[PDB]
Amino acid sequence: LPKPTLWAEPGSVIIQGSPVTLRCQGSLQAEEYHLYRENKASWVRRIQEPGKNGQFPIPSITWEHAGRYHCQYYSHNHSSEYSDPLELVVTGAYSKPTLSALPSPVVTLGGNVTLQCVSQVAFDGFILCKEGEDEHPQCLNSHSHARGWSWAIFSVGPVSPSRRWSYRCYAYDSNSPYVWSLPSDLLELLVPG
Amino acid sequence: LPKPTLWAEPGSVIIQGSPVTLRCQGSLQAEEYHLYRENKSASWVRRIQEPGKNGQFPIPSITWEHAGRYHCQYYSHNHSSEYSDPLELVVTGAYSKPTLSALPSPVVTLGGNVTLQCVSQVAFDGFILCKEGEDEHPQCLNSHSHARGWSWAIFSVGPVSPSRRWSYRCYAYDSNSPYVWSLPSDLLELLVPG
C-alpha cells in the first residue's frame, strides 16, 4: 500500500533557530506513523479520525535534527511501506564561504562564467543556490557514486519553473574536459498545481 | 590597448555536424586578431582593414580536435592589447551516452526535493548537468573541485540565461556531517544588459 509523502512545510535547508514542520501525506485511513532514523526511536502522532494529515512541528531546531527523515502511516490492521527519506539541513555552523565571479560579475548575453566558492578551511562539500521571483531560495548539491561504479549526481531542492523545465546530462573524462559524450534522453520533470 | 573578449555566436557548446562561429570584439581602431593556444596547441590569425567591424573566426564543420580553451588579443598601432580571458570550446557526441534518472521519480511538488542522476557505463569522472531553455539553448553547469591547498569548489557554467531576480549564495559542509551547512555568504548578482 502506497508509501507516504513527506516534505517540510516551510522548507528543507533552514537556519538554526527557525520554526519548521514535517508534514506527512499518505492514505487518509491512517492511524499511526514513523519518523526520524539514525539509530533505530520514533515520533508517533496517533491522529484520531479526522481529515487533517499528521504534522510534526518544531519551533527551535538544532544541528542534531539534521539527517534523513521518513514517515509511515499505520492502519487499524494494515501496515504501510516507508516513504521517501527527507533531507533536513541546518545552516550557519561553520565559517561562511566566498562566492567569486570569474572572471567578471558582468556577463555577456548567453556567455560562460566561473563562480568560485572558497573558504578559509579545507572542505570537500559545497552548495550553490539561486534566487527567483515570488518563491524563496533554492540550492543544489552534487555527490558521486564512485563506490562500485563511477557517475556523479545532482541534488536539487525546491524547484521553481516559469517556461521550459527539461534536463539533459553529459559525460567525459579528465583527460579532456572539453570533448564530451552524447546528451542523455530528455528528462521531463513533473509538477502539480 | 584595452582587453578584448571573445564569444561564440551559435553557442560555445555544439554537436558534430553543426556550425561553430566565434567572435572577439574590441576597439574600432584595431587592425588584426589572434587565437588560442595551449601546452601543445596551434595558433591562428586573421587581418582587418583599419576601422572596427566585428572580427570573426569560423569553423563550419566543427571537429573534436578544435575542442580547446581559446584566447583573443588584437593589434593597434605599435603595441598589443592583453590576451582576453580564456574561453573553452566544447565539442560533444564523441562516445557512449549516459542516462538521466530523476530518483526516485521526476514528478515533484513546487518545493519538493529531487536528485537527478546521470550514470555512465564507462568509468568517467566529468559529468555536467544541463537544463534546457525555452527559446534559449540549454544552459550547462559543470561541477569540478580542487585538491591542493585546502580544497574548495568551483561551478563552471556555460551560457548564462538570466530570468528573474538575480542573486547567488554559497555554503560548505563536512564529510562526516553533511546535513549541516555553514553560515550564508555575501550575495552575488550577474550583470546582463538589454
B117 residue type, one letter: Q
CA angle, corner A109, sides to B128 and A190, nearest 5?
50
Nearest Cα residue to A96 out of B32, B77, B182: B182
Residues in chain A: 193
Q: How many CB atoms lie within 10 A of CB B65?
A: 10
Q: Do A93 and B157 touch (CB under 8 A)?
A: no
**For B134, left (φ over 0), alpha (ψ -120 to 50), or beta?**
alpha
* Alpha-carbon gap, residue B67 to B144, rounded angstroms: 19
Under a CB-based contact definition with an 8 Å cutoff, are residues B10 and B18 in contact? Answer: yes
Q: A127: buried, middle or exposed (CB in 10 Å: 19+, 13-18, 0-12)?
A: buried
Based on the number of CB atoms within 10 Å of its own CB, is A128 exposed (0-12), middle (13-18) or buried (19 or more)? Answer: buried
User: Strand pairing partners for B188?
Assistant: B168
Nearest-CA distance A36 → chain B (Å) = 14
Residues in chain B within 8 Å Cβ distance of A163: 133-134
Number of H helices, E strands in chain A: 0, 13
* Cα-to-chain-centroid distance, residue B166: 19
> Are B72 and B43 in contact, with CB atoms under 8 Å apart?
no
Classify the C-alpha dihedral A113-A119-A123-A126 as positive or negative: negative
Closest to A130 in 3D by CA, of A143, A115, A119: A115
Cis peptide before B184 (omega within 30 of 0): no
CATH superfamily of B1-94: Immunoglobulins (2.60.40.10)
Strand pairing report for B128-132 and B139-145: antiparallel
Instruction: Name residue B126's beta-bridge partners.
Output: A172
Q: Do domains B1-94 and B95-194 have the same CATH topology?
A: yes
In the 3-class helix/strand/coil scheme, how is chain B assigned residue by residue?
CCCCEEEECCCCEEECCCCEEEEEECCCCCCECCCCCCCCCCCCCCECCCCCCCCEEEECCCCHHHCCEECCCCECCCCECCCCCCEECEEECCCCCCEEEEECCCECCCCCCEEEEEECCCCCCECEEEEECCCCCCEEEEEEECCCCCCCEEEEECCCCCCCCCCECEEECCCCCCCECCCCCCCECCECCC
A57: closest CA of chain B, how far (Å): 17
Q: Which residues partner with A47 through β-bridges?
A: none
How far, in Å, CA of B117 to CA of B99, rounded? 8
SS3 A163: coil
CB B160 within 8 A of CB B130: no
For residue A1 the three cell numbers come to: 500500500
- In the numeric block, which cell numbers belong to residue B110? 513546487
- Whether residue A73 contacts residue A30, with contact meaning beta carbons closer than 8 Å, is answered with yes
What's the CATH fold of domain B95-194?
Immunoglobulin-like (2.60.40)
Please provide the size of chain B in residues.
194
Contact list, B174 vs chain A (CB under 8 Å): 94, 123, 125
CB pairs A-B closer than 8 Å: 371
- Reading phi first (left if > 0) and then psi (alpha if -120 to 50, else beta), residue A105 is in alpha
Distance CA B184, CA B194 (A): 31
Question: Contact B169/A99 with Cβ under 8 angstroms?
Answer: yes
Query: Which residue in chain B has the smallest CA separation from A167?
Result: B131
For chain B, which residues make up each domain, given as ranges?
1-94, 95-194
The answer to whether residues B86 and A170 touch, using CB atoms and an 8 Å cutoff, is: no
Tell me whether B26 touches chain A (CB under 8 Å): no
Retrieve residue A105's grid coordinates: 560579475
B residues 144-183 lying closer than 8 A (beta carbon) to A:
144-145, 149-161, 163-175, 177-183
**What are the φ and ψ backbone dihedral angles of A33, each rounded to 5 degrees?**
-155, -155
User: CB neighbours (10 Å) of residue A130?
Assistant: 17
Classify A94-193 by CATH class. Answer: mainly beta
CA B27 to chain centre: 24
Distances (CA, A) of B56 to A73, B10, B18, B44, B71: 64, 12, 17, 12, 13
* Contact assessment for residue B68 and residue B39, using Cβ atoms and an 8 Å cutoff: no
Q: Which of A153, A152, A156, A177 is nearest to A165 (CA)?
A: A156
Q: C-alpha angle A164/A157/A12, rounded to 5°? A: 145
Q: Which residues contact B14 (CB under 8 A, 6 or more apart)?
A: B8, B20, B62, B90, B91, B92
Cβ-Cβ contacts under 8 Å for B143 (sequence gap 6 or more): A142, A152, A154, B127, B128, B129, B153, B155, B156
Beta-bridge partner residues of A58:
A20
CA distance A90 to B48: 58
- Give ∠ CA B47-B51-B56 in degrees, rounded to 5: 45
User: Rounded CA gap, A187 and B13, in Å?
Assistant: 20
Beta bridge mates, A45: none
Cα–Cα distance list, A25 to A2, A7, A9, A89, B18 (Å): 10, 9, 12, 21, 49
For residue A133, give the amino acid letter: E
Strand pairing partners for A118? A98
The CATH classification number of A1-93 equals: 2.60.40.10
Say if residues A166 and A186 touch (Cβ distance below 8 Å): yes
Specify the amino acid at residue B24.
C
Interface of A with B in 78-107 (CB under 8 A): 84, 86-103, 105-107
Technique employed here was X-ray
Give the gap in angstroms from C-alpha B5 to the nearest C-alpha of chain A: 10
